[PDB]
């Protein structure tokens, strides 16, 4: 066809090619042309002519006003941040200075600055630069506290709820509790004057904070209180955030039927309003992938994560913390899915990219590294055992040891000794020590893991079952403590039947462990019995696990808002 370009696109290419001479008069253009000039500068590769223009806060304020092309602004901004110029830090520092300067001005100028800060902080926290998003939200909060007017109280609540989302993503959990205390103080004195603000967003951020800190029971309580505060007038972003956080909170509490409809409604709301290529939609797919990766749904969790990564690889791609989180979450999911075959070339690649991005944009002692350095390690040992060279075996085992020890130290410093995450680190160390032929302290690691898991998650829980399964595999295969392995294997299969039924993936591993257990003690009739059970289990895995793409399983126009939340509330 070869249609000619419009006069708009031809004029853009006639202004960009004369940018350096008319850079002053471009800033006076309409806000919907200024973005097109700057996006053309990005497209031509003239990032330094562009990074010289986005660093000023006033120029970036009008660029942020174009909400239609925010999906292009995220790509442009992410292309600046890995180009070398630190646009995120510069904008935050400039906004902090301007807030500290106009703190003494009237209410209108302060309100305009607070709105500019809300949009800029929403963009920066949306782009993932959390450490450069506190300096904007903290300045907005400081602007809020000066005058005791009512809108100032409500916007201080907004500053606290948005700032709390930044710190949870930045893994500053110790300050999240103080931020929530400040927010609840502001909302208490808001309700003292006779009006109540909406508590859904704040309590959802509490749910995310406590689930990240692995306080599963209190996370469930706070997501209950969050979904008790959901109305139709809420923005769909807040609504879908609350549902996805509550869906994460429901899975760790082993209530999957509620989490099913919760995550289905969250994915539906994210797809209907935002779109199939939106970062919030990518976040909802990450939570959906977490849900599927928990309840036995592994052949589709990778497909969910690949869709989740491909959105973040396109909306804002390169070296970014959200892309790194998608790579890390996919790598563990690909590690689980591809575990049966034994090959790990792709999973290790997706784990290494998550390592190579977080180590570039975050400090080397940051918690998000710990949540990633495990995954690569969990792959390396699996590559290590399947290798054949002994030097390579030992080197990859020691590399996994270093990664697990660093992650364990970070988790122990952040949360503490008695937590689920530290117990998971202990279990990883125990299975690695089993892989490293050091079986004496492998038992100590596994028992330390189980005594912390069962104390917090109860005697019957998925993590407890997995840890005791690892301990039983240690006992029956290598430490020759066959008598103690039987009760642990029975506990593992019992918890698997209670939670996941007979379709659990680890049932194959524990049934093979039981086969080897009974072969050693010569009880051949039990060998025959569990061989028949294993064949039945394989048939079952071949029966109710059909090809059902979860991007389609969410359907279209399901139970809408005020219906899924109500059913979930009355289902308590």
């Amino acid at each position: 066809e070869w249609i000619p370009e419009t006069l708009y696109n031809t004029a853009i290419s006639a202004v960009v090619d004369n940018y350096i001479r008319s850079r002053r008069d471009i800033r006076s253009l309409p806000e919907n042309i200024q973005f097109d000039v700057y996006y053309k500068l990005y497209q031509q590769g003239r990032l330094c002519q562009l990074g010289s223009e986005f660093c000023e806060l006033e120029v970036f304020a009008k660029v942020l006003r174009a909400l239609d092309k925010r999906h292009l602004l995220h790509h442009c901004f992410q292309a600046l941040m890995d180009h070398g110029v630190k646009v995120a830090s510069v904008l935050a520092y400039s906004f902090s200075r301007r807030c500290s300067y106009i703190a003494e001005s009237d209410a209108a100028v302060k309100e305009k600055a607070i709105q500019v800060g809300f949009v800029l902080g929403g963009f920066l926290s949306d782009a993932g630069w959390y450490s450069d998003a506190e300096k904007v939200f903290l300045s907005c909060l400081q602007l809020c506290t000066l005058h005791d007017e009512m809108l100032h109280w409500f916007r201080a609540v907004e500053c606290c709820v948005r700032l709390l989302h930044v710190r949870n993503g930045n893994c500053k959990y110790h300050l999240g509790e103080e931020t929530f205390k400040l927010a609840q103080t502001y909302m208490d004195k808001l309700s003292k004057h006779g009006q109540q603000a909406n508590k859904a967003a704040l309590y959802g951020e509490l749910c995310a904070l406590l689930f990240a800190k692995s306080h599963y029971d209190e996370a469930y309580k706070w997501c209950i209180e969050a979904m008790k505060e959901i109305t139709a007038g809420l923005p769909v972003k807040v609504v879908v955030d609350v549902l996805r956080q509550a869906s994460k909170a429901c899975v760790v509490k082993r209530e999957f039927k509620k989490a099913e409809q919760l995550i289905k409604h969250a994915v539906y709301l994210a797809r209907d309003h935002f779109g199939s290529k939106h970062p919030k939609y990518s976040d909802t797919l990450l939570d959906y992938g977490f849900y599927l990766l928990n309840v036995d749904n592994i052949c589709q969790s990778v497909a969910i994560y690949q869709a989740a990564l491909d959105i973040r690889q396109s909306v804002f791609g390169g070296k970014n913390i959200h892309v790194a989180t998608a790579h890390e979450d996919l790598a563990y999911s690909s590690y689980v899915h591809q575990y049966s075959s034994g090959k790990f070339d792709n999973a290790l690649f997706h784990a290494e990219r998550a390592i190579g991005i977080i180590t570039h944009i975050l400090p080397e002692d940051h918690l998000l590294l710990a949540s990633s350095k495990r995954v690569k390690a969990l792959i390396l040992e699996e590559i290590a055992i399947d290798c054949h060279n002994k030097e390579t075996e030992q080197r990859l085992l020691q590399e996994a040891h270093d990664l697990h020890l660093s992650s364990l130290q970070l988790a122990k410093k952040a949360f503490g000794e008695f937590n689920v995450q530290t117990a998971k680190h202990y279990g990883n160390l125990g299975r690695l020590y089993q892989s490293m032929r050091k079986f004496k302290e492998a038992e100590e690691m596994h028992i330390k893991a189980i005594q912390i898991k069962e104390q917090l998650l109860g005697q019957e829980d998925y993590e407890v079952a997995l840890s005791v399964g690892h301990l039983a595999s240690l006992y029956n295969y290598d430490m020759n403590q066959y008598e103690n392995a039987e009760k642990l294997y029975l506990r593992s299969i019992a918890i698997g039947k209670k939670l996941f039924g007979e379709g659990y993936s680890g049932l194959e591993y524990d049934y093979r462990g039981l086969i080897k257990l009974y072969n050693s003690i010569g009880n051949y009739e039990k060998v025959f019995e569990y061989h028949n059970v294993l064949s039945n289990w394989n048939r079952l895995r071949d029966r109710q696990y059909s090809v059902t793409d979860a991007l389609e399983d969410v359907s279209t126009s399901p139970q809408s808002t005020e219906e899924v939340v109500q059913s979930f509330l009355i289902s308590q």
């Binding site: 006069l7 708009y8 006639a14």
Partner: protein, 96 residues
């Protein structure tokens, strides 16, 4: 047919209506109480657009209609680098 375009300085720019209907804003200005066909020549009046940019706008109208879905290689529109910005500002206002 042959709609007449007037700049801010009084420069009439009579051009074919099908040529000037490729821009959404002129299409809107002609529609409504705009087809004032008493004079048989519609009289859209731009009191903001100068004539030195309206000239290039009409030239682009001819360029766009003539080269529409053409099989040959379409030459680039030669926008002067002085009025490149002003033309740009008349590019989204006219939605051409």
């Amino acid at each position: 047919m042959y709609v007449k375009l007037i700049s801010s300085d009084g420069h009439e720019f009579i051009v074919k209506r099908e040529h000037a209907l490729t821009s959404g804003t002129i299409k809107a200005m002609l529609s409504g109480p705009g087809q004032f066909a008493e004079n048989e020549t519609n009289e859209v009046n731009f009191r903001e657009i100068p004539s030195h940019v309206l000239s290039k706008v009409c030239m682009y109208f001819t360029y766009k209609v003539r080269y529409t879905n053409s099989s040959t290689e379409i030459p680039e529109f030669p926008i002067a680098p002085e009025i490149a910005l002003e033309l740009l500002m008349a590019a989204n206002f006219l939605d051409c």
